[PDB]
Structure formats: structure tokens, C-alpha cells
């Protein structure tokens, strides 16, 4: 029943985003990039795939940093083409994906605001997907983040700042805590919105958002051992969004040890067999080299569902895996350190 | 001299700031200088004059690829403090500059 | 299996036999303990924090050697001087030659205990890590002989007839081609590069997906052939005479198996003599810990009235209650001297 | 001088490859690390030494450790960090000894 | 040889004071109560309670570290006699 519509408004954008999926580099394409010896040879090998002639005009010395941003500028103009054509079941959905980059741009903007610097920080050092080229009051704000928070509510992140006291961000809360509290309220608001959309985009997306909350649950309670943040702080840094919510979030708040987050991960059979990264073994995939492969596995299963909006959010998270992989290929080649060049994530 | 200074490169300083050598007293200056593609040779030379005249700077780290431009400025510095070192870049490996003092 | 350890001073050493009359609860053996030197109050109480540090530490040593006993090949064969753990508990004495009764009990008894077992402890982490490296290299051993022909070690598949040696201008490159791409390769292998010897297509071996084959080719065109092979999904694997040293890795395929066999005997005899000494030291710190706090909670005319106990399962709730009524009348967390010891290892 | 100068070239090469690894795991930190500097965690104090009555200036390093990157990453990464920190605090352990 | 320290504590915490002192010192201590009358006031700790006196001899000179933890845990104020 929710499937014989959704070609009225979003029929053209489903085939367009699936046509972009066929250009994601496969296992055979990744083997050709490994055998390169120079970044000049990597430029000719990338000409066989969809990327071709994207590094034609840059320079004779090809640094790895100009490969990075030119890869990320291609996926921006691919995404910005799609957001201009979604009418309104999908334009507000595509706006939700850019809120993850709007959060990272806002916290980057409040730090220099506390240290008395302005617009020159904004234009070169912000993500183009969640950007500030509209709502021009936020650009002219050089005030010390109290007359600028009243400007910051003029921005679609205003619904997430209702747990953010304006004085509390003025150096009374740690700058990393103000990211993970914003990403917390972003995740339930994105989980609730995909639950209002019914049918295929409710069981192809909330399985991805359940694991994303439990990446946020596990990595917080492991990297908060040596540092002086209380257990009530990391308990409110946990998104109430996924499989660990009524039971596992209580046990992660009491951990104090890596072994105690391990046995509470063994209660969930999907989240165990991911905790075998085992960095005590000298050379092996670490815990977050196993969380990434489970992340792209759920995004790959999103394409098996057909009439749904989750094909768009999976496409951004897999095109971001391309810019992570090719840079990791190019940084092993430019440093001539290709003994761990196989540690990429082979999505397709 | 109690501080370590770094001129470095873009990827070099963010590794060394993670080591714990960065310090910002808002009166005088920052004790580092990120050198990007669009900064002039003069701006590297002023901050080199800043770190040599600063009292708290005891060590001056700099990549040798960046030190190849200000080489005329550091060949005249022949004092014991602050020490100037040339560290290798992500791309650029190594060799010159202190053995001018010893052949 | 759990174990229980309670001392009850206040004849009174016939009244512990009245606790053996509680036959539904435990068997309640003696564990007689020789007298140790007294002569302190101040550093005696300060000792008890160090004995609290020691027994929690040295039980961690004997627990991780129990989980390491799966590595040698669950099973309970942990003997102590030709004695099972439970039959040693009923007949444990202090040795009086390894831990002297003449010296003061507090520091130089506990230091030679602590220096001794820690020397066993760091020797365990250094020696066992070396043998664990050899099985990790043996984990790489069968990993070399697994997978497809591109990634498998080629130490057995070689033949000198399948190569053109004598390097002057020619070389055989090992190219692997999928089975579905067979007909497109046998028409194009002549024209993937210039100056290809146009008849050298011979299928060395195959798998269920692909086949391994040879191309004799000029030395100056090895790269352009490899480049055009990648453009039409053929894979070039380079080969050299290090396979004659991989024949010495076939020796290492036997060598890593033999040093696995050679070091296995020395490993288990190292564990059996050390953990038996480690477990005996774990009982001796309990005898020191029950010697202290029994002269504090109870009196010291000369010495406290010593007795110990024997384990219990699924009546431990009523064992606590039958002992709480007897010993809350003694005094004005347990209301007597008590130390939970844990018999099972894992 | 010559022996430890080719030894820091291998350590700084290892620290540079650690950097790449961290960026693969954990976003981009080229503005978070640069903006948040307030005070120094590694400092030096000039000690004195002598050979045949010639006073030699020498450097001694010490950590007044208040970690300004105590919470960096913490949601994505933060395990590649605090070993990139270890790869670079060991680098400034050696670069002070070379200086 | 030694063994004196005395101080002040509120009357509402004396029953749990002597029980916690009996537990962590493991016997070997002597405490005699002495009660005072109508409420006094220390400005920040503590405001407007009627307090009492305690004598904690112990004689130990290692137990001195094992009782100063107890007086700060129960928030008592001791004076040099």
C-alpha cells in the first residue's frame, strides 16, 4: 500500500541515486588502486572509473591533501543536485542528513567566537554539505556567543538547542560535551521523523539508526575512562534511540573498565562478534575498523529495499567511505608505507 | 626558555599540538604558525624573528622544506638558544643546515 | 566449587567439633596453623592493608594461568605436591623452610612471598608471550596455504618448465584469469602489450573460479602488459626465486610445527611447577591474613584459639544464619573473622 | 648527532603514518586541535653541564600535565587519538633530547 | 606512651559514630561519651545542633591515620588538648 505512490514526486530521484551507486568502486577497482606506485599513477587509474579528469587542473606536484578535498567536493555537488529536486517528503529528509554537518560547523564556529575571531574562520574551514551561505545574520556575528546564540536560533538547528542553555555554552560546559549533547538530540529527532514516514523507509532506516546510537553508546563509554567526566555526564551523552536503551545504557554508565563494556556487549549477539577487534594482537583490525564494516553492511542492505527514502542516506554514508578509502590508499602510497594498504573497507 | 615552538606544516603542527607543546598567551603571540599554500615568505620570516626574540622559546621546530626558504635567515642565527631543528615532512625526507657549523 | 574460611576463638577447641555436629552444612576440618612472631601493634594494622593488597593481587596471578591452560591444546588436573586442591586444604601446613617461623611474620615473611611470586609472575608474561608468537606465526602458516591461487603461497605448484629463465630479454609473468573471461583472454593476450610471444598460453592449474596460466614476454614490456591486464580485469602476480626460500618456508612449515612440539613440553612443566608454588603461596597469605585480625577482634593472652572450615553449596544462607546467632553474642560484613577464598579457578 | 637524527626521521615517519590512520578513523581534526590551545602540557627547563670547566647548556623536559585534548573525538575515534598523542609525546621526548 | 585526641560531634550522629569506629578499627579502642546541652553553632559546619564530646585514645600511632579519616567522614572538629 505505501509503494504504488512515491514515484509521483520521488521516482526520478530514486533511479538517479541508484545510478550513482553503480559508480562506487568495487573490489576489482580497489585492486587497481593498490598496485599504483605514485600519486601521479593514481590519477591515471582513477580515470577509468566515474571520477575521471577531476584532478586535471591542480598542479604538477600532487599532494595528498588536494586529493582529499577534491574527492569531497565531488560528492557535495552530487548531493546538492539532489536536494534541489526533492519536493517535500524528501527535501526535509535530505535536510536532516545535513544537520550532522551543521552541528560540526556550529561547534567549529563557537570556538573562534569565544577566542574573538570571525568570518575568515567560516568560509575555508567548514563542511560544504551543512553550510552557512544563507541566513546572513550568523556571518555578521562577532559578538562573544551571547548575542550570537540569539542569532543561532534563526537556523534549523534551533530545535536541538532546547537542551542547550546559552550561558552553559559560554565555557561552563566542555566543548566536546556540547557536540555529543547536540548529536544526542539530533538522533532522536531523526529517529522520530523516520518513524512518522511509514512503510519501507521505517524498517530500512531505523536498523541503521539503532546501530549508530550504539556506536555512540560504546565509543563514549570506552574513551571516557582516563578523563574526569562523571558517570552522570556520559549517561546523558547516550542517545535514547536503539537496542541498548532500557537495559544496556544503565550498564555502560557503571563500567569503569573495558572488560565490563565487553560482557554487556555479549548480551547482544549482533554487537558481540564485533568486539573481537583485539588490539592486544599487534597487527589487526581495531574496534572501530570493525564498527565501520558493520556500518557499511547496514547501508548496503538499504539498497535491497526499493521504495523508500533510506537509499539517499545510505548513499551519502557510502560515498563518504570512498573519500575515506582513496585517501587511505593515497596516504599509504605517498608515504610509501603500503604494508597496511589492505586495511580499507571494501563496500562493493 | 620554557616553551617549544613549531612552524612545521599543516599536518605537522596538529600532531605536535596533540603532543602538548602549544601555548597561547593572548598578549604577546601564539607560539606556533601554521604555514599553508597561500602565505608569503615574509610572514614565515617575521614569525622566525618573533620566536628568536621571544624569551620563553627554547626550541624551534621547523620542517626543512619550510626551512629551505628562510635558510638565509637561519644561517645568520649562530647562538646557543633557541635551538633550531629541522624535522622531515610527510612528503620530503632529509639533509642540510647544521653541518654548515661543522664540515 | 567455592570454599569457606572462618576462625572462631573465644574446651573451645572442642566447640568447633560441635560445629562438625552440624553435618548438614559442612565437614569442618581443622587447618592447624603454627604460631608466628608477635611484638607489634602499629605496623601490624598497617600490614593488614598490604595483605589486603596481596591476596587480591596473587589470586589474579593464579587465575590468569588457569585461563592460559587452554592454550596448550575445563580439565581439572591441578595437583599440589602430588595433591588435589581439596585434599591439600585439610592437610596444609606452613613449610617452615620456605617461609620461616623464626623471623617476624609481618614484613620479611610477606616480602619473600611477594618478591617470589612476582618473579614467577613477570617470568610468566615474558616466556609465554614468546611461545604465543610461534603459534601466531603458525596461524600465518595455514593462512598462506588457503584461498585462491592469487593469494595462496605457491611453494608446491611450481615447475621449472613453466618459466623461461636466463633473463637476457625474456621473462614468464604469472597471470591469473577468471574462467568466464577465458575466451576473451586467449584472443587478447597477444595484444595486451607490444612484442608478446604470441603462443605461450598454457594453463598451469585451475580453481573453481579461475585458472592460473603463463605468458612469456619481453623484459621491457612487463608494466604495459600489467597495466592493460588490469584494464581488462586480468591480474599479474610477480614471481621470483624466493620460492626456493619458500621451500625453506616449507621447512618453516615443518619448523614452526616442531618448535610448537618442542616448546609444548617445557611449557606445561613450567606451568606445573610454578602455579603449584603460586597456589601454595596463595594459601600462605591466607594463613597470614587469618593470623592478623584474629588478635584484634579477639583477645591476645598469648595466642588466639585457631580453627578453620570446609566448603558448602546451596545451604550457605543458613550457614550464615546459624553462625550469626552464635557469634553476635560474641561481640557487642561478618560479625567474626572471615575471608572468602575461591576454590574454582576459572 | 648523526645517529639520533636518522632515528628521529624514523619516529616522525611512524608518527606521520599514525596521523593518517587517525584521520581514516576519525573525521578531520585540523581545526579542533588548532583552535583549542590555551596552555602548554610539555615544557623545558635549562640545566647546566660541564666538560673541562666549559659550562654546557642542556635541556630537561617535564610535563605539567593538564590535558587540553582530554575529550577529542570521543564519539568517532578517540582510540586512534591517545595513541597518536603517544606517538607524538614520544616524538617530543626525543626531539628535546636531540635539541 | 601516647594515645590522646578529643573533639566535638553532634548528638544525632553518636550512635552510628561508635558503630563505624568499632568496625574499621577492629576492636582495640576506648570511647567514652560526654553530652553537652542547648545548641551551639559553627558557621558553615555545623549550623544550630546540640553537640557532644568524644575521647578516642586508641594508643596506636598508626590508627591515628585510621581515625582522622573517620572524623572527616562524620564531619567532626577536634582541638589540641
Swiss-Prot record, chain A:
One of its GO terms (cellular component) is vacuolar proton-transporting V-type ATPase complex. The modification Phosphoserine is found at residue 280. It comes from the Eukaryota. The keyword Hydrolase does not apply. GO terms for molecular function: proton-transporting ATPase activity, rotational mechanism. Coiled coil: none annotated. Keywords: Cilium biogenesis/degradation, Cytoplasmic vesicle, Hydrogen ion transport, Ion transport, Lysosome, Membrane, Phosphoprotein, Transport. GO terms for biological process: cellular response to increased oxygen levels; cilium assembly; intracellular iron ion homeostasis; pH reduction; proton transmembrane transport; vacuolar acidification; vacuolar transport. The N-terminus is blocked. It is a peripheral membrane protein. Expressed in brain (at protein level). InterPro entries: ATPase_csu/dsu_sf, ATPase_V0-cplx_csu/dsu, ATPase_V0-cplx_dsu, V-type_ATPase_csu/dsu, V-type_ATPase_csu/dsu_dom_3. It is found in: Membrane; Lysosome membrane; Cytoplasmic vesicle, Clathrin-coated vesicle membrane. The modification Phosphotyrosine is found at residue 267. V-ATPase is a heteromultimeric enzyme made up of two complexes: the ATP-hydrolytic V1 complex and the proton translocation V0 complex. The V1 complex consists of three catalytic AB heterodimers that form a heterohexamer, three peripheral stalks each consisting of EG heterodimers, one central rotor including subunits D and F, and the regulatory subunits C and H. The proton translocation complex V0 consists of the proton transport subunit a, a ring of proteolipid subunits c9c'', rotary subunit d, subunits e and f, and the accessory subunits ATP6AP1/Ac45 and ATP6AP2/PRR. Belongs to the V-ATPase V0D/AC39 subunit family. This is V-type proton ATPase subunit d 1.
UniProtKB/Swiss-Prot annotation, chain B:
GO terms for cellular component: clathrin-coated vesicle membrane; membrane; synaptic vesicle membrane; vacuolar proton-transporting V-type ATPase, V1 domain. One of its GO terms (biological process) is pH reduction. Gene3D superfamilies: ATPase, V1 complex, subunit F. It is found in: Cytoplasmic vesicle, Secretory vesicle, Synaptic vesicle membrane; Cytoplasmic vesicle, Clathrin-coated vesicle membrane. It comes from the Eukaryota. Keywords: Cytoplasmic vesicle, Hydrogen ion transport, Ion transport, Membrane, Synapse, Transport. SUPFAM superfamilies: AtpF-like. Pfam families: ATP-synt_F. GO terms for molecular function: proton-transporting ATPase activity, rotational mechanism. V-ATPase is a heteromultimeric enzyme made up of two complexes: the ATP-hydrolytic V1 complex and the proton translocation V0 complex. The V1 complex consists of three catalytic AB heterodimers that form a heterohexamer, three peripheral stalks each consisting of EG heterodimers, one central rotor including subunits D and F, and the regulatory subunits C and H. The proton translocation complex V0 consists of the proton transport subunit a, a ring of proteolipid subunits c9c'', rotary subunit d, subunits e and f, and the accessory subunits ATP6AP1/Ac45 and ATP6AP2/PRR. Subunit of the V1 complex of vacuolar(H+)-ATPase (V-ATPase), a multisubunit enzyme composed of a peripheral complex (V1) that hydrolyzes ATP and a membrane integral complex (V0) that translocates protons. V-ATPase is responsible for acidifying and maintaining the pH of intracellular compartments and in some cell types, is targeted to the plasma membrane, where it is responsible for acidifying the extracellular environment. Belongs to the V-ATPase F subunit family. This is V-type proton ATPase subunit F. It comes from Bos taurus.
UniProtKB/Swiss-Prot annotation, chain C:
GO terms for biological process: pH reduction; proton transmembrane transport; synaptic vesicle lumen acidification. GO terms for cellular component: clathrin-coated vesicle membrane; plasma membrane; synaptic vesicle membrane; vacuolar proton-transporting V-type ATPase, V1 domain. Keywords: Acetylation, Cytoplasmic vesicle, Hydrogen ion transport, Ion transport, Membrane, Synapse, Transport. The modification N-acetylthreonine is found at residue 1. Belongs to the V-ATPase C subunit family. V-ATPase is a heteromultimeric enzyme made up of two complexes: the ATP-hydrolytic V1 complex and the proton translocation V0 complex. The V1 complex consists of three catalytic AB heterodimers that form a heterohexamer, three peripheral stalks each consisting of EG heterodimers, one central rotor including subunits D and F, and the regulatory subunits C and H. The proton translocation complex V0 consists of the proton transport subunit a, a ring of proteolipid subunits c9c'', rotary subunit d, subunits e and f, and the accessory subunits ATP6AP1/Ac45 and ATP6AP2/PRR. Subunit of the V1 complex of vacuolar(H+)-ATPase (V-ATPase), a multisubunit enzyme composed of a peripheral complex (V1) that hydrolyzes ATP and a membrane integral complex (V0) that translocates protons. V-ATPase is responsible for acidifying and maintaining the pH of intracellular compartments and in some cell types, is targeted to the plasma membrane, where it is responsible for acidifying the extracellular environment. Subunit C is necessary for the assembly of the catalytic sector of the enzyme and is likely to have a specific function in its catalytic activity. This is V-type proton ATPase subunit C 1.
Amino acid at each position: 500500500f505505501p509503494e504504488l505512490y512515491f514515484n509521483v514526486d520521488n521516482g526520478y530521484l530514486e533511479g538517479l541515486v541508484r545510478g550513482l551507486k553503480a559508480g562506487v568502486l568495487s573490489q576489482a577497482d580497489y585492486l587497481n588502486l593498490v598496485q599504483c606506485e605514485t600519486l601521479e599513477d593514481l590519477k591515471l587509474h582513477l580515470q577509468s572509473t566515474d571520477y575521471g579528469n577531476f584532478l586535471a587542473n591542480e598542479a604538477s606536484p600532487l599532494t595528498v591533501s588536494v586529493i582529499d578535498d577534491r574527492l569531497k567536493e565531488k560528492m557535495v555537488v552530487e548531493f546538492r543536485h539532489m536536494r534541489n529536486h526533492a519536493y517535500e517528503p524528501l527535501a526535509s529528509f535530505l535536510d536532516f542528513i545535513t544537520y550532522s554537518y551543521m552541528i560540526d560547523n556550529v561547534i567549529l564556529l563557537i570556538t573562534g567566537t569565544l577566542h574573538q575571531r570571525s568570518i575568515a574562520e567560516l568560509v575555508p574551514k567548514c563542511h560544504p554539505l551543512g553550510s552557512f551561505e544563507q541566513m546572513e545574520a550568523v556571518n555578521i556575528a562577532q559578538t562573544p556567543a551571547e548575542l550570537y546564540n540569539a542569532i543561532l536560533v534563526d537556523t534549523p538547528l534551533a530545535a536541538f538547542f532546547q537542551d542547550c542553555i546559552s550561558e552553559q555554552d559560554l565555557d561552563e560546559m566542555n566543548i566536546e560535551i556540547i557536540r555529543n549533547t547536540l548529536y544526542k538530540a539530533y538522533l532522536e529527532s531523526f529517529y522520530k521523523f523516520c518513524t512518522l514516514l511509514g512503510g519501507t523507509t521505517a524498517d530500512a532506516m531505523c536498523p541503521i539508526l539503532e546501530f549508530e546510537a550504539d556506536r555512540r553508546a560504546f565509543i563514549i563509554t570506552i574513551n571516557s575512562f582516563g578523563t574526569e567526566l562523571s558517570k552522570e555526564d556520559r549517561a546523558k551523552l547516550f542517545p535514547h534511540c536503539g537496542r541498548l536503551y532500557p537495559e544496556g545504557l544503565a550498564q555502560l554508565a557503571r563500567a569503569d573498565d573495558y572488560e565490563q563494556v565487553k560482557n554487556v556487549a555479549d548480551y547482544y549477539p549482533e554487537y558481540k562478534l564485533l568486539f573481537e577487534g583485539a588490539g592486544s594482537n599487534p597487527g589487526d583490525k581495531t574496534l572501530e575498523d570493525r564498527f565501520f564494516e558493520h556500518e557499511v553492511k547496514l547501508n548496503k542492505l538499504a539498497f535491497l529495499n526499493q521504495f523508500h527514502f533510506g537509499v539517499f542516506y545510505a548513499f551519502v554514508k557510502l560515498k563518504e567511505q570512498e573519500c575515506r578509502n582513496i585517501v587511505w590508499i593515497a596516504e599509504c602510497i605517498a608515504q610509501r608505507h603500503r604494508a597496511k594498504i589492505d586495511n580499507y573497507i571494501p563496500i562493493f | 626558555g620554557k616553551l617549544i615552538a613549531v612552524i612545521g606544516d599543516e599536518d605537522t603542527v596538529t600532531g605536535f599540538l596533540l603532543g602538548g607543546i602549544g601555548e597561547l598567551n593572548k598578549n604577546r603571540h601564539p607560539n606556533f604558525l601554521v604555514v599553508e599554500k597561500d602565505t608569503t615568505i615574509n610572514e614565515i620570516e617575521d614569525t622566525f624573528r618573533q620566536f628568536l626574540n621571544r624569551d620563553d622559546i627554547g626550541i624551534i621546530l621547523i620542517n626543512q622544506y619550510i626551512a629551505e626558504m628562510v635558510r638565509h635567515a637561519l644561517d645568520a642565527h649562530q647562538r646557543s638558544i633557541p635551538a633550531v631543528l629541522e624535522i622531515p615532512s610527510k612528503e620530503h625526507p632529509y639533509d642540510a643546515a647544521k653541518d654548515s657549523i661543522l664540515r | 566449587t567455592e570454599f569457606w574460611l572462618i576462625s572462631a576463638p573465644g574446651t573451645w577447641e572442642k566447640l568447633h567439633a560441635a560445629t562438625t555436629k552440624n553435618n548438614n552444612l559442612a565437614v569442618s576440618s581443622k587447618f592447624n596453623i603454627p604460631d608466628l612472631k608477635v611484638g607489634t601493634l602499629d605496623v601490624l594494622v598497617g600490614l593488614s592493608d598490604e595483605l589486603a593488597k596481596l591476596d587480591a593481587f596473587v589470586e589474579g596471578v593464579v587465575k590468569k594461568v588457569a585461563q592460559y591452560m587452554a592454550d596448550v591444546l575445563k580439565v581439572q588436573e591441578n595437583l599440589l605436591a602430588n595433591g588435589v586442591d581439596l585434599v591439600t586444604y585439610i592437610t596444609r601446613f606452613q613449610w617452615d623452610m620456605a617461609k620461616y617461623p623464626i623471623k617476624q611474620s609481618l614484613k620479611n615473611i610477606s616480602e619473600i612471598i611477594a618478591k617470589g611470586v612476582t618473579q614467577i609472575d613477570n617470568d610468566l608474561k615474558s616466556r609465554a608471550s614468546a611461545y604465543n608468537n610461534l603459534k601466531g606465526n603458525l596461524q600465518n602458516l595455514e593462512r598462506k596455504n588457503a584461498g585462491s591461487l592469487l593469494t595462496r603461497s605457491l611453494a608446491e605448484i611450481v615447475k621449472k618448465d613453466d618459466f623461461v629463465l636466463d633473463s637476457e630479454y625474456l621473462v614468464t609473468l604469472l597471470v591469473v584469469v577468471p574462467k568466464l573471461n577465458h575466451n576473451d583472454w586467449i584472443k587478447q593476450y597477444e595484444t595486451l602489450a607490444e612484442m608478446v610471444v604470441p603462443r605461450s598460453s598454457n594453463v598451469l592449474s585451475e580453481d573453481q573460479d579461475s585458472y592460473l596460466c603463463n605468458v612469456t614476454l619481453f623484459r621491457k614490456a612487463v608494466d604495459d602488459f600489467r597495466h592493460k591486464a588490469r584494464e581488462n580485469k586480468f591480474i599479474v602476480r610477480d614471481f621470483q626465486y624466493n620460492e626456493e626460500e619458500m621451500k625453506a618456508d616449507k621447512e618453516e612449515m615443518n619448523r614452526l610445527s616442531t618448535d610448537k612440539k618442542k616448546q609444548f613440553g617445557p611449557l606445561v612443566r613450567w606451568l606445573k611447577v610454578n602455579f603449584s608454588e603460586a597456589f601454595i603461596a596463595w594459601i600462605h597469605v591466607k594463613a597470614l591474613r587469618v593470623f592478623v585480625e584474629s588478635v584484634l577482634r579477639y583477645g591476645l593472652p598469648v595466642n588466639f584459639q585457631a580453627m578453620l572450615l570446609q566448603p558448602n553449596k546451596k545451604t550457605m544462607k543458613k550457614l550464615r544464619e546459624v553462625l550469626y546467632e552464635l557469634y553476635k553474642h560474641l561481640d557487642s560484613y561478618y560479625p567474626y573473622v572471615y575471608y572468602k577464598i575461591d576454590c574454582n579457578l576459572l | 648527532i648523526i645517529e639520533t637524527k636518522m632515528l628521529m626521521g624514523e619516529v616522525m615517519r611512524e608518527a606521520a603514518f599514525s596521523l593518517a590512520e587517525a584521520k581514516f578513523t576519525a573525521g578531520d581534526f585540523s581545526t579542533t586541535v588548532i583552535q583549542n590551545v590555551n596552555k602548554a602540557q610539555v615544557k623545558i627547563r635549562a640545566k647546566k653541564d660541564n666538560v673541562a670547566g666549559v659550562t654546557l647548556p642542556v635541556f630537561e623536559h617535564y610535563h605539567e600535565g593538564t590535558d587540553s585534548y582530554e575529550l577529542t573525538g570521543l564519539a568517532r575515534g578517540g582510540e586512534q587519538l591517545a595513541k597518536l598523542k603517544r606517538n607524538y609525546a614520544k616524538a617530543v621526548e626525543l626531539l628535546v633530547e636531540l635539541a | 606512651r601516647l594515645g590522646f585526641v578529643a573533639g566535638v560531634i553532634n548528638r544525632e550522629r553518636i550512635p552510628t559514630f561508635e558503630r563505624m569506629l568499632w568496625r574499621v578499627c577492629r576492636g582495640n579502642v576506648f570511647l567514652r561519651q560526654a553530652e553537652i546541652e542547648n545548641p551551639l553553632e559553627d558557621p558553615v559546619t555545623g549550623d544550630y545542633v546540640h553537640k557532644s564530646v568524644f575521647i578516642i585514645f586508641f594508643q596506636g600511632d598508626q590508627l591515628k591515620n585510621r581515625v582522622k579519616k573517620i572524623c572527616e567522614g562524620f564531619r567532626a572538629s577536634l582541638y589540641p588538648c
